[PDB]
């Protein structure tokens, strides 16, 4: 079960380097590819294999490909860390270029050279043991996201139709550029919605709200918060990396996280830590929206699915008591009778619980109805400007170049696909949506 991570532009690669660093630390595997563990033992209680390739000389590199349109970003990571990356598996765009921060730009690089990005991906898969689903991280609106990330999902669906496609989505434009980026966001979502199996959204507000409270430099926004987000995106593989039993693979988890795949985006909730206590409280602390990654006014949302993994000095009696708020606080899935699922333990042994520590940390994720606040921002913005003529006519590259008719139709059809996502979030919480499913049967 091997995982290869595809890292799109600054989003993918910066978080990627921060994550690989966090993993370099968690497995004592080395930021330079050299194990930090003593040679006093040949045995291990972890599993680095799925994320790192072991060489014949016991040296390590991650199973990841940096995205091709932004070679300066690829170089940032490959040169800063270097020994812990393998550049020979990295595709670099055929023209050495990125024609704007747009869908058309990266989409066209991707469609023109789909075969070359796939040849690099496909050749790495052949070197591994049982490839497990693809992992992708991108800014939905950006050149590497709306453009190439969108193209990768299409490319992967046809080349690897038998594999799971899972992505990480980060927040859309945070400024007035939204009148442009919202169009890219929508075209990007059309592809994300139609092609991925599962995903998740990370809101800027939490990166910044956390930044303001955790760093002693509160003026930090997307940089450095990338390490905070990389500790958030660690909970995704800890049960694999520091293996457990209950939820040890992708196919064994996604059926539990999002039974109804159209609502493919989860809402994470996490308590940050440096790189409080009780299982009772860490679980309960994550029901508080201020720790969520898609924060909003809906302090009383409904849920379709809730899941949580707690890692640390775990106490099952406390977990049992924490369950009281499952019963009192979660508006029930009146349409499907779902319930919360959990997993526990497997603290990295190389970053052990310290003496006198009873602290735990963990991740709660949920399929929540009221997550429209991180999607509507584009859907209900780009359309009012679009209706007056697209504001992306300076990105007439590839499909947007071929015809102004394609420009207007791609944007409008993608909005309808996104609208279905918005319609599904809402329809899904209605009891009448699914009651007729079994009654008229």
Partner 1 sequence: YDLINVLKHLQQIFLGYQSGHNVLKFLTKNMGELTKHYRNDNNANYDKLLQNFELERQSENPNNLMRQLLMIQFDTETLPQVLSHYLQIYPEVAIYHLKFDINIPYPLNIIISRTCMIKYQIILRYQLVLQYHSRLLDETWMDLNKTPSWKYRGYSHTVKRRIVRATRVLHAKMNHFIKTIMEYFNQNVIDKEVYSLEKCYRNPTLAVAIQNELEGGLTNIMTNRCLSDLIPLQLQIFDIVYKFCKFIKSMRAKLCQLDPVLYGYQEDAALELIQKLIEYISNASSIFRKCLINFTQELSTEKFAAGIERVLYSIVPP
Partner 2 sequence: NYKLTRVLQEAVQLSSLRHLMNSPRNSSVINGLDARVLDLGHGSVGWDVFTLDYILYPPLSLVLNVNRPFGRKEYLRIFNFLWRFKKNNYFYQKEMLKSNDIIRSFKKIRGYNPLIRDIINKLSRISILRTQFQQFNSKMESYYLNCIIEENFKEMTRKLQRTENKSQNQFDLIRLNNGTIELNGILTPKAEVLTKIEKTLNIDELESVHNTFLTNILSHPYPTSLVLLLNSVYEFVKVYCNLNDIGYEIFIKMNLNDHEASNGLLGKFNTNLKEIVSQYKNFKDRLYIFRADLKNDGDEELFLLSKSLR
Q: Which residues bind ligand GDP (CB under 6 A)?
A: 8-11, 14-15, 68-70, 101-102, 105-106, 139, 141-145, 170-174, 202, 204, 207, 222, 226, 229
Provide long-range contacts, Cβ within 8 A and 24+ apart, for 153-157: 153/191, 153/192, 153/195, 153/196, 154/110, 154/191, 154/195, 155/110, 155/114, 155/117, 155/118, 156/121, 156/195, 157/195
Q: Residue 333 binds which one of partner 1, ligand GDP, partner 2, none, with CB within 5 to 8 A depending on kind?
A: partner 1
Helices and strands counted in the chain (H then E): 17, 11
> Which of 38, 39, 42, 328 touches partner 1 (CB under 8 A)?
42
Of 194, 145, 148, the C-alpha closest to 171 is: 145
Q: Could you give the C-alpha distances from 223 to 211, 218, 298, 351, in angstroms and in order? A: 10, 12, 28, 25
Alpha-carbon distance 420 to 194, whole Å?
A: 11
- Give first-to-last CA distance, the chain, whole Å: 39
Q: How many CB atoms lie within 10 A of CB 330?
A: 17
The reply, when asked if residue 83 is annotated as ligand binding, is: no
Alpha-carbon distance 192 to 257, whole Å?
A: 18
Residues of this chain that interact with partner 2 (CB under 8 A) are 40-42, 44-46, 48-49, 130, 157, 161-162, 194-197, 243, 245-246, 251-252, 255-256, 259-262, 316, 320, 323-324, 327, 337-341, 344, 436-438, 441
Q: Does 356 bind a second copy (CB under 8 A)?
A: yes
Do residues 143 and 100 lie in contact, with contact meaning Cβ atoms separated by under 8 Å? Answer: yes
The reply, when asked if residue 345 is annotated as ligand binding, is: no
Q: Does 359 bind a second copy (CB under 8 A)?
A: yes
> Which of 9, 33, 143, 345 touches partner 1 (CB under 8 A)?
345
Q: Residue 326 binds which one of a second copy, partner 2, partner 1, none, with CB within 5 to 8 A depending on kind?
A: partner 1
Of 426, 375, 427, the C-alpha closest to 201 is: 375
Q: Residue 440 binds which one of a second copy, partner 1, ligand GDP, none, with CB within 5 to 8 A depending on kind?
A: partner 1
Residue 422's region, left for phi above 0, alpha for psi from -120 to 50, else beta, is alpha
Enumerate binding residues for a second copy (CB under 8 A): 55-57, 123, 126-127, 276-277, 281, 284, 288, 325, 356, 358-359
Enumerate binding residues for partner 1 (CB under 8 A): 1, 42-43, 45, 47, 130, 161-162, 164, 197, 239-240, 243-249, 251-252, 254-256, 259-261, 316-317, 319-320, 323, 326-327, 332-334, 336-339, 341-346, 434, 436-438, 440-441
Question: Binding site for GTP: which residues?
Answer: 141-147
Question: Binding site: which residues?
Answer: 141-147
């Amino acid at each position: 079960g091997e995982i290869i991570t595809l890292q799109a532009g600054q989003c993918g690669n910066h978080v990627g380097k921060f994550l690989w660093s966090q993993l370099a630390k968690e497995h004592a595997i080395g930021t330079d590819g050299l194990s930090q563990l003593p040679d006093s033992s040949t045995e291990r209680d972890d599993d680095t294999k799925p994320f790192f390739r072991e060489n014949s000389r016991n040296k390590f590199t991650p199973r990841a490909i940096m995205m091709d349109s932004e070679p300066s970003v690829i170089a940032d990571v490959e040169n800063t860390f270097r020994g812990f990356f393998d550049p020979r598996n990295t595709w670099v765009a055929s023209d050495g270029a990125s024609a704007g921060n747009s869908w058309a730009n990266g989409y066209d690089i991707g469609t023109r050279n789909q075969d070359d990005i796939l040849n690099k991906i496909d050749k790495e898969i052949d070197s591994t043991d049982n490839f497990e689903g693809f992992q992708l991280l991108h800014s939905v609106a950006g050149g590497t996201g709306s453009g190439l990330g969108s193209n990768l999902l299409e490319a992967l669906c046809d080349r690897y139709p038998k594999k799971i496609l899972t992505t990480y989505s980060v927040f859309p434009a945070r400024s007035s550029e939204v009148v442009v980026q919202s169009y890219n966001t929508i075209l990007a979502l059309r592809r994300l919605i139609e092609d991925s199996d599962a995903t998740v959204v990370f809101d800027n507000a939490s990166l910044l709200n956390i930044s303001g409270k955790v760093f002693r430099n509160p003026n930090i926004d997307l940089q450095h918060t990338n390490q905070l987000i990389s500790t958030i995106i660690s909970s995704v593989t800890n049960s694999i990396r520091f293996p457990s039993y209950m939820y040890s693979s992708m196919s064994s988890i996604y059926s539990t996280l999002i039974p109804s795949p159209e609502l493919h985006f989860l809402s994470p909730s996490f308590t940050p830590f440096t790189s409080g206590h009780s299982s009772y409280d860490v679980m309960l602390d994550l029901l508080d929206p201020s720790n969520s990654l898609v924060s909003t006014a809906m302090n009383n949302p409904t849920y379709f699915n809730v899941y949580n993994t707690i890692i640390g000095n775990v106490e099952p009696r406390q977990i049992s008591r924490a369950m009281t708020k499952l019963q009192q606080r979660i508006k029930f899935p009146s349409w499907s009778s779902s319930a919360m699922h959990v997993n526990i333990g497997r603290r990295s042994p190389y970053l052990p619980l310290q003496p006198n520590e009873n602290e735990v940390s963990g991740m709660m994720l949920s399929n929540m109805s009221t997550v429209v606040n991180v999607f509507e921002n584009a859907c209900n913005t780009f359309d009012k400007v679009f209706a007056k003529g697209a504001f992306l006519n300076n990105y007439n590259v590839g499909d947007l170049f071929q015809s102004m008719q394609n420009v207007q139709d791609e944007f409008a059809e993608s909005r309808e696909v996104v609208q279905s996502l918005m319609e599904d979030y809402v329809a899904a919480e209605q009891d009448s949506y699914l009651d007729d499913v079994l009654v008229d049967d």
